Amino acid sequence: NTNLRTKTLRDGTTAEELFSQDGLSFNDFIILPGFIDFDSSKVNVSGQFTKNILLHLPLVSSPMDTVTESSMARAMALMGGIGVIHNNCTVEQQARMVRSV
Amino acid sequence: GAVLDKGSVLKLLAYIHKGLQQSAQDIGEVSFDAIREKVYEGQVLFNRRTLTAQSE
Amino acid sequence: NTNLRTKTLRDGTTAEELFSQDGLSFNDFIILPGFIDFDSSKVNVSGQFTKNILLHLPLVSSPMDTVTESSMARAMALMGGIGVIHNNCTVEQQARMVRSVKLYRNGFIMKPKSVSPDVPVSTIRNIKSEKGISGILVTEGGKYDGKLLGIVCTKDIDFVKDASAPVSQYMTRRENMTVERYPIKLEEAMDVLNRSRHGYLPVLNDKDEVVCLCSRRDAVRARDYPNSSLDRNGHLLCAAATSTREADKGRVAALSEAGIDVLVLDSSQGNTIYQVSFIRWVKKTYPHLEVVAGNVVTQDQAKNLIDAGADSLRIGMGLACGRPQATAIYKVARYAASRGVPCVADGGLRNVGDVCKALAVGANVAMLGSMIAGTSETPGEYFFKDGMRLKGGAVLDKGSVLKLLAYIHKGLQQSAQDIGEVSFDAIREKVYEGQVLFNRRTLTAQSE
Amino acid sequence: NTNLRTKTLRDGTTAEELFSQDGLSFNDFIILPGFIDFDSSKVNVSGQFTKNILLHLPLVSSPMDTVTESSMARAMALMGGIGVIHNNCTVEQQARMVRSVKLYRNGFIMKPKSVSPDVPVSTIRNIKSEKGISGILVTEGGKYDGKLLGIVCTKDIDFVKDASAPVSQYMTRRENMTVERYPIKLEEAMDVLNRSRHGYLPVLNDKDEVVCLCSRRDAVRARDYPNSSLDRNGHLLCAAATSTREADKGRVAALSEAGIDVLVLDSSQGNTIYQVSFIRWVKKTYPHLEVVAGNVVTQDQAKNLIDAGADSLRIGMCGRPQATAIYKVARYAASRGVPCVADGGLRNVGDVCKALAVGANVAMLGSMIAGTSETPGEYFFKDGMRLKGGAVLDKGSVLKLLAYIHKGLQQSAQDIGEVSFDAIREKVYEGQVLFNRRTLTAQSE
Ligand SMILES: Nc1ncnc2c1ncn2[C@@H]1O[C@H](COP(=O)(O)OP(=O)(O)OP(=O)(O)O)[C@@H](O)[C@H]1O
Ligand SMILES: Nc1ncnc2c1ncn2[C@@H]1O[C@H](COP(=O)(O)OP(=O)(O)OP(=O)(O)O)[C@@H](O)[C@H]1O
Ligand SMILES: Nc1nc2c(ncn2[C@@H]2O[C@H](COP(=O)(O)O)[C@@H](O)[C@H]2O)c(=O)[nH]1
Ligand SMILES: Nc1nc2c(ncn2[C@@H]2O[C@H](COP(=O)(O)O)[C@@H](O)[C@H]2O)c(=O)[nH]1
User: Fold this and answer.
1) Does A25 touch chain B if contact means CB atoms closer than 8 Å?
2) H or E element in which residue D240 lies
3) CB-based contacts of C277: which residues, under 8 Å, 6+ apart?
4) What are the boundaries of the signal sequence (chain A)?
5) What is the distance in angstroms between the Cα of C306 and the nearest Cα belonging to chain A?
6) Nearest-CA distance from B2 to chain A in Å?
7) Which residues of D71-95 are buried (b: 16+ CB within 10 A; e: fewer)?
8) CA D315, CA D384: separation in Å to the nearest integer?
9) What are phi and psi of A63, to 5 degrees?
């Protein structure tokens, strides 16, 4: 299907051009649609958290004392993402939370 | 310093997950690795919206 | 007057230049005035719905379950536009609605509604409430092509109290009826029916069997609505929507039998292998049907669907705030125009100003959704709340769509007059030519 | 079911007690529920407009030029209410409007619209477009009582291309017409008409001159609108407004001759010598007319106008609170056999019900029906809204709206536990229908 998927007319702004001026918000632009020959269930959303770690789910929980402790970090990793235990606590507390995950 | 209950994060993650897939489907690539690549390649394209185009 | 009309100074932005940057809304710009040497009444607002269909009125009703069913589709076609029957219903229901639009206006009525003499008066009173017709023929066996016994009309049964009485008791019987013999020209049949001062004229063969029927209503409809959108057979035009699943192949056949003229593909993004496969299949299997592909918003999408053989394209949305409709329409319509394919503007039309802009920047016709919801001819039940009359997720009553269409119509003419061209075909041409010019408005210029 | 319907515990406030203090709006109280042993459809909402006129539908269209000209008055009367032709117009205009209402529905149409054979089709199309009538008779010299030559109907001229042609060519000639001979009882002529499958039946004298006419349309309107408000001649009822100046004595004569059944006095405050005098004059001069005095808001005003010979009173018009005003004035006037019209403060069906329950026989609608199809003015568009022209939204046909208010009153009466509003009014005074005042906190949901 490469003939149908690849653009020749290329009607739209390229990213290099889009960001070549003002500082933009996400609201300042939209992504133009392409060509579909597959069910959305087959889409691979994975991404590299780090050079050697690939998250199946490109989601990381923020390291805030109101969001990520042992319980959240567990949930994130189970779903394919990861958690970052906040550092607003004693060294003993934070390590206790890591062991717990 | 108070926020609404949003249920289990497990349900919320699966909702985000399903949302990413529908969006990447709209763009027309079967992975975000490919979307990133083709953004740089100039095959995935954008449109800047005017401010009044953003109000509708 | 060409010397006075054609611009040399050309003070204003060209369209190619206007849309060369940001994605624009219709509000982001205005069309600069031209030169006027004609009354607005003479303006030709027509546009191509598809390659072979030209709408006198560049208006299409949206295929939503809240806007277009049989009643609306009738109204649109009568005024010179067209309707697209929504696809949120069984195949049987949707086809029932198509037949209902096609057979509303006839030349010769081929399968006239018939009943037997046994049938009670009550039954005929139900037919005028449901189908909306009279002049029901009473034939042998109820067969629509049986021996003609009589005819039932309004003044025959309005005074009757016992609704159980057979029709034979109150019908006008064959001996007293004025009929005609087949074959006869339609031109003559209607002159006979007119001079006859009756509302109906059966046409029979040698054995007094019913061949067809003429209605005087189809004479006045031809008179009160001289711009109606008709097919070769004098029947109103009717489009219908459909998805592009394999299952929907069966739905297309049904609609084809019911006699739609245009197939509108229903998709929020039509640049799919499915839609492409589907279009190819329709054109191969049903060559007589024109197909409106979509929705699309880019030239790249548009290329694929025109390749597959689309006769038209829907531009717009209908996740997800997408490509600004003004830009989308300009870009796609221009591309498609080169491939000889017209475009339908489908989204972002809040008022008449917007519709005019959408047609000037390249759309041949505009699809109306919200702008006509709440009119008499839309599906829904009327009700009251807080002294307001509503329809049903509830909208205000807007009277008959027929009045509203004529208001849009008059509005397009005044606008095209301001621009200074006697047709929207010419405005589109001269937009591309760089003779009709625009001005982008600043945001504060838009606040006054 | 008396042992169930009659209250002995009597948990609630009587009206006499409820209105014994400060002036109440309709929102200040509610009517406590009763006992139900009947379907709502069986409820009789009728009320006395004047002493001798009982409206099936206790609703009157206001005499405002925004609301009631000829078209509205018809619609009201057909549904069982009545219209009051406004007076912001010439005497000539106002009587012309009255005639349109009276001569709309007939039994026998006297003075049929008739034309000469020389007249072009163009004229028949204009009579059809303006006055809305068809079945135009063709007679000698166009005299409504001339020798009958033919009849012109829609199917005779809808197909004609040359609008200047004389009706003679396309009319149905007297030779081919089904007629009848005078005298003939109406109910028999209407039977011939139904049997003939025609839309019109002229009745002639011995010399083939037109005495009167029968319209099949009038037979459908008796079938479709069985509760139409009619006089003793089968015409729709019609009221018209007038002020009480000397100048207006002329106006009353014109309106009386046009055929009004009820005169409605237009005054911001009716307790004036001018109205007292005027009422006496109308009664000495035109005793066949019922008069509606007002507006008034106190018993003291009511006495003077009732003394003068009023047959009804407008209650309303910043001022005295309307719920109190209706109660205080209506109770007094009831004791003297005079019914009252509620004219003010009616924003919804709920208000209407309360107004009628606390003593008004009929209500006068103004704003609540402004913007309906039948009100004067033209429609126009703006901002995706349909409007009339100071502007109001399209409310559709008033006929649908009136049926809504009707069913609304029936539902309300059912909750209160009585099968008629006469009953409710009676039992309010008797203390068997009870209310409850509401705190301002209890009003805010
Ligand atoms: N072809 C015909 N020949 C003779 N009489 C007819 C014919 N068609 C209808 N009629 C009679 O004419 C009378 C009604 O006339 P007409 O058909 O003009 O009424 P109409 O208002 O057009 O009916 P509808 O409103 O139901 O269409 C009836 O008695 C009917 O039987
Ligand atoms: N009294 C009559 N005798 C004979 N023919 C009549 C009579 N009245 C009307 N007609 C004829 O009937 C035809 C018109 O149809 P009809 O009378 O059934 O009602 P109509 O045309 O629907 O009435 P309207 O003009 O109010 O619409 C014409 O040909 C007319 O000449
Ligand atoms: N007798 C009669 N039949 C009509 C008229 N108009 C349409 N028809 C026919 O009535 C049929 C519609 O009824 P259905 O088939 O839906 O029961 C179609 O065959 C249509 O052509 C009319 O005015 N009179
Ligand atoms: N021919 C005819 N006359 C009517 C009909 N209905 C009312 N009229 C009469 O037409 C006349 C109209 O009065 P005008 O408006 O001309 O003063 C009145 O005499 C009225 O009674 C109708 O259906 N046909």
Assistant:
1) no
2) strand D239-242
3) C244
4) none
5) 12
6) 10
7) bbbbbbbbbbbbbbbbbeeebeebb
8) 38
9) -90, 70
Structure tokens that stand for D351 in this block: 């208000």
B47 vs A contacts (CB less than 8 Å): 12-13, 29-30, 32
Could you tell me whether strands D392-393 and D385-388 are parallel, antiparallel, or unpaired per DSSP bridges? antiparallel
- The Cα–Cα gap between C144 and C211 comes to 8
Which of D155, D368, D394 is nearest residue C197 as measured by Cβ atoms? D155
DSSP C161: S
- The values of phi and psi at residue D369, to 5°, are -125, 5
Q: Which residues contact A99 (CB under 8 A, 6 or more apart)?
A: none
* Contact of B43 with A56, CB cutoff 8 Å: no
Least CA distance to C317: which residue of chain B? B56
At C252 the three-state DSSP class reads helix
Chain C neighbours (≥3 Cβ pairs under 8 A) are: A, B, D
User: For residue C58, is the peptide bond before it cis, meaning its omega torsion is within 30 degrees of 0?
Assistant: no
Q: Which of C245, C242, C310, C315 is nearest to C91 (CA)?
A: C242
Interface contacts (B, C; CB < 8 Å): 39
d(Cα D289, Cα D252) in Å, to the nearest integer? Answer: 10
A46·B26 Cβ contact <8 A:
no
Beta bridge partners of C82: C60
What gap in Å lies between CA D61 and CA D375, rounded to an integer? 10
Coil, helix or strand at residue D213: strand
Contact B44 A79 (CB under 8 A): no
Name the minimum distance, in Å, from the CA of A71 to any CA of chain B.
Answer: 10
**Contact: B20, A11; criterion CB under 8 Å:** no
Kindly report the backbone phi and psi dihedral angles of residue D34, in degrees, each rounded to the nearest multiple of 5, phi listed first: -120, -130
DSSP state of C88: S
Technique of determination: X-ray
CA–CA distance, D174 with D139 (Å, rounded to integer): 10
B56 contacts chain C (CB < 8 A) = yes
Is C133 close to ligand 3, i.e. is its CB under 6 Å away? yes
Q: Three-class SS of residue D136?
A: strand
Strand locations in A1-101 (E): 29-31, 47-48, 54-55, 60-61, 82-83
Which residues lie closer than 8 Å to D375 by C-beta, 6 or more apart?
D66, D67, D68, D69, D71, D72, D369, D388, D398
Q: How far is CA D110 from CA C344, D107, D145, D236, in A?
A: 59, 9, 9, 15
Q: Is C309 on the interface with A (CB under 8 A)?
A: no
Amino acid identity, residue D265?
Answer: L
| Resolution, angstroms, 1 dp | 2.8
Is the Cβ atom of C115 under 6 angstroms away from ligand 3?
A: no
Integer Cα distance of C6 and C435 in angstroms = 7
CA distance C209 to C200: 16
C185 Cα–ligand 2 center, Å: 27
3-state helix vs strand vs coil in chain C, percent to 5: 35, 20, 45
Ligand nearest to the CA of C151: 1
**From the CA of C177, which ligand is nearest?**
1
Facing residue for C304 by CB, picked from A4, A10, A30 = A4
Would strands C82-85 and C59-61 be described as parallel, antiparallel, or unpaired? parallel
**Tokens representing C150?**
């009589």
> What is the rounded distance in angstroms from the CA atom of residue D148 to the CA atom of residue D179?
10
Q: Strands across the sheet with D385-388, in order? A: D379-382, D385-388, D392-393
Contacts of A78 (CB under 8 A, 6+ apart): B10
Nearest partner of B54 among C443, C341, C120, judged by Cα: C443
> Cα torsion for B19, B22, B28, B29, to the nearest 10°?
50
Q: Could you give phi then psi for residue C399, rounded to 5 degrees? A: 70, -165
